[PDB]
A paper describes a structure:
Interestingly, PMX is a multitargeted antifolate that also inhibits the folate-dependent reactions catalyzed by glycinamide ribonucleotide ([name]) formyltransferase (GARFTase) (in the trifunctional GARFTase/glycinamide ribonucleotide synthase (GARS)/aminoimidazole ribonucleotide synthetase (AIRS) enzyme) and 5-aminoimidazole-4-carboxamide ribonucleotide formyltransferase (AICARFTase) (in the bifunctional enzyme AICARFTase/inosine monophosphate cyclohydrolase (ATIC)) in de novo purine biosynthesis. Although all these antifolates are used clinically, their use is often associated with dose-limiting toxicities arising from the lack of tumor selectivity, as well as emergence of drug resistance. By metabolite rescue in KB cells and in vitro enzyme assays, de novo purine biosynthesis was identified as a targeted pathway (at 5-aminoimidazole-4-carboxamide ribonucleotide formyltransferase (AICARFTase) and glycinamide ribonucleotide formyltransferase (GARFTase)). To better understand the molecular effects of modifications to 6-substituted thieno[2,3-d]pyrimidine analogs on GARFTase inhibition, we determined the structures of select analogs (4, 5, 9, and 10) with a range of inhibitor potencies in complex with GARFTase and β-[name] substrate. The thieno[2,3-d]pyrimidine scaffold of all analogs makes polar contacts with the backbone atoms of Leu899, Glu948, and Asp951 in GARFTase.
Thus, in addition to replacing the 1′,4′-phenyl ring by a 2′,5′-pyridyl ring in compound 4, we introduced an ortho fluorine in the 2′,5′-pyridyl ring to afford compound 5. Compound 5 harbors the same polar contacts between GARFTase and its l-glutamate as 9 and 10, and the pyridine N of 5 now forms the intramolecular contacts with the amide NH, as indicated in the crystal structure. Taken together, our comparative analysis of the crystal structures of the fluorinated compounds 9 and 5 versus related des-fluorinated compounds 4 and 10 provides molecular details in the solid state, which account for the dramatic increase in potency in one case where an intramolecular fluoro-hydrogen contact may be important and another in which an intramolecular pyridine N-hydrogen contact with the amide NH is necessary. Both intramolecular bonds in 9 and 5 restrict the conformation and are clearly important for GARFTase inhibition. The presence of a fluoro-amide hydrogen contact and a pyridine-amide NH contact was corroborated by NMR and was also seen in the crystal structure of GARFTase in complex with compounds 9 and 5, respectively. For compounds 5, 8, 10, and 11, adenosine was completely protective, establishing de novo purine biosynthesis as the targeted pathway. Neither compounds 5 and 1 nor MTX inhibited ATIC up to 200 μM.
Numbering used by the authors: 808 to 1007
The structure:
């Protein structure tokens, strides 16, 4: 399975995905890394691993649909089968999401459906949970509401901050995201016609 990884930032999840897909038994190959922001650290991790990169500045486009179309063009150029959103922060448009339905995965740093949106850790800390986690799900049109593939709980320790909590949660992200990609890449898991997770 040919994979594109979209990033907006540091690329720790990207790096975990690079490491896992180099394993001999990997069912996925990362063929392109797309960033919507220039000179982010994930672009370096990609070049060090010998993976093509492309910056598609969202700031240059009239609206989401145009910008998504620019991404889609690169996805076709590279005959991509699966899209991983790994720290990619731009909400995608309906048509793009529908096109990639069942082929696009996103990592989210909470146990969905808790704490959807961009600042999950802040919410988690403000709410006072003692267990949080991360969620790999298919991208549906409703942000952070697509079908759930894997999750891993992570404890909240007293005194935690966004810095310390997100650091612990990212250790789980680097486990379940490579695992979720391998499940989809190998056809073990797919989005069902009824729209629920299907473990073939
Ligand atoms: N249809 C669809 N379904 C999905 O499940 C899904 C998941 C995605 C992964 C991205 C993370 C989820 C998320 C993204 N973005 C924002 C946000 O407010 N983003 C600002 C830009 C802020 C910035 O640039 O840092 C904006 O895009 O306007 C947010 F609150 C939460 S994208 C997507 N699209
Ligand atoms: N709303 C989406 C979101 O919060 N994404 C989060 O951004 C980080 C990216 O880190 P990375 O750039 O080191 O992979 C990850 O912690 C991921 O869960």
């Amino acid at each position: 399975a040919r994979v594109a990884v979209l990033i907006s930032g540091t690329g720790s999840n990207l790096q975990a995905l690079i490491d896992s897909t180099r394993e001999p038994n990997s069912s996925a190959q990362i063929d392109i890394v797309i960033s919507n922001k220039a000179a982010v650290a994930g672009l370096d991790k990609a070049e060090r691993a010998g993976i093509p990169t492309r910056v598609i500045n969202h700031k240059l486009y009239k609206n989401r649909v145009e910008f998504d179309s620019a991404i889609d063009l690169v996805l076709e150029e590279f005959s991509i089968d699966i899209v991983c959103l790994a720290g990619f922060m731009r909400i995608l448009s309906g048509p793009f999401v529908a096109k990639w339905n069942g082929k696009m995965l996103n990592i989210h740093p909470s146990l969905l459906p808790s704490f959807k949106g961009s600042n999950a850790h802040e919410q988690a800390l403000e709410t006072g949970v003692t267990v949080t986690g991360c969620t790999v799900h298919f991208v549906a049109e409703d942000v952070d509401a697509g079908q759930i593939i894997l999750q891993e709980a992570v404890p909240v320790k007293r005194g935690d901050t966004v810095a310390t909590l997100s650091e612990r949660v990212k250790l789980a992200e680097h486990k379940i995201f490579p695992a979720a990609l391998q499940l989809v890449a190998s056809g073990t898991v797919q989005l069902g016609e009824n729209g629920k997770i299907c473990w073939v």
